[PDB]
Design a binder for this molecule. Structure first.
Ligand SMILES: CCn1c(-c2nonc2N)nc2cnc(Br)cc21
Lengths: 20, 338
């Protein structure tokens, strides 16, 4: 399921703003 | 009054403060350090108690040298200058600001209810009326900000606090900017970036409307429309021109999201001749009483558990670090206006 794929992903915690 | 009339008065108030910013309104020695509420490349947010009043506040602390290394000088000056000038029910209040030899301080209203992010991840997802209640607040906040020529640039659940009445407060103004023309800085959060930012184009306030589409999708689905393990894979999905909706999304919600998550700028809602009215008048918002939301007369779908004005149970725990103040002034010229 899309939920299972999200939960197993490395991006479920707080997401940082980008840096260059 | 009309929306045009209300916004004209709001602009007059903002401009007076924008042109003559408040500076050096408190001192670190006036606050008692309680606990770290959050951290990031920007620095940290600490729960503090103002001794003279007994009030609790959220103190955002930035290390001047670290801001310089991250090339965030202009962005930090924008943040403070904008925060001290704005006034809107769904915007966090900047109570005081000051700096010392080492750090910059922005003392903000404390929301013990915590971040929308925490509640959203824990609950899993918000039902459509719950998501709509929060979305209406963002629509009104962006109409207010955009009328002042302010672009927000970092909408996400991590940046939205839930107050004691269940209403939301936008807090982070680290990438906000007052710009009349187009702008070019690559900034924001991967999942929320509009295609025109990824593609290094000159962009405008329409990026905030795309970000609203991402937020509504995330609130209602429990996961964002574009996600992957790495930012590059997220960008490929965003630019692909394709989006998939959960089967439980209402027809009205999918239609609104197709208009917000619109790669074509001549077709993106918020960016047309009718402006924000294309969003406010959409079928998905038919039950929304815009005035009642602004006046905070609508019963909130969720009230965070109140455990005291200084309780931190709605926040994660962070490693506590010293607040060091050097005996020598750092970056004096760079932050002269702060
Ligand atoms: C820790 C969450 N947080 C808060 C607040 N956390 O509790 N009340 C707040 N206000 N204000 C922030 C400003 N910038 C940032 Br970046 C994060 C912030």
């Amino acid at each position: 399921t899309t939920y299972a794929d999200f939960i197993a992903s490395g991006r479920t915690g707080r997401r940082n703003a980008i840096h260059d | 009054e009309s929306v045009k009339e209300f916004l004209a008065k709001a602009k007059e108030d903002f401009l007076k403060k924008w042109e003559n910013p408040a500076q050096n309104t408190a001192h670190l020695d006036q606050f008692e350090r309680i606990k770290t509420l959050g951290t990031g490349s920007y620095g940290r947010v600490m729960l503090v108690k103002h001794m003279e009043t007994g009030n609790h506040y959220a103190m955002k602390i930035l290390d001047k040298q670290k801001v310089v290394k991250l090339k965030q000088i202009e962005h930090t000056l924008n943040e403070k200058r904008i925060l001290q000038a704005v006034n809107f029910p769904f915007l966090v209040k900047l109570e005081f600001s000051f700096k010392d030899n080492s750090n910059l301080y922005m003392v903000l209203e404390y929301l013990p209810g915590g971040e929308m992010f925490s509640h959203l991840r824990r609950i899993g997802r918000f039902s459509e009326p719950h998501a709509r209640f929060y979305a209406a607040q963002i629509v009104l906040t962006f109409e207010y900000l955009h009328s002042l020529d302010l672009i927000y640039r970092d909408l996400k659940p991590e940046n939205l606090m839930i107050d004691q009445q269940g209403y939301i407060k936008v807090t982070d103004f680290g990438f906000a900017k007052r710009v009349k023309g187009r702008t070019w800085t690559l900034c924001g959060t991967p999942e929320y970036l509009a295609p025109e930012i990824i593609l290094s184009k000159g962009y405008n306030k329409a990026v905030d409307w795309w970000a609203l589409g991402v937020l509504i999708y995330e609130m209602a689905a429990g996961y964002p429309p574009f996600f992957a393990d790495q930012p590059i894979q997220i960008y490929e999905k965003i630019v692909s021109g394709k989006v998939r909706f959960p089967s439980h999304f209402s027809s009205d919600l999918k239609d609104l999201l197709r208009n917000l998550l619109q790669v074509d700028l001549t077709k993106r809602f918020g960016n047309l001749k009718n402006g924000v009215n294309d969003i406010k008048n959409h079928k998905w918002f038919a039950t929304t009483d815009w005035i009642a939301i602004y006046q905070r007369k609508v019963e909130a779908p969720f009230i965070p558990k109140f455990k005291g004005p200084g309780d931190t149970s709605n926040f994660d725990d962070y490693e506590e670090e010293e607040i060091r103040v050097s005996i020598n002034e750092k970056c004096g010229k760079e932050f002269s206006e702060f």
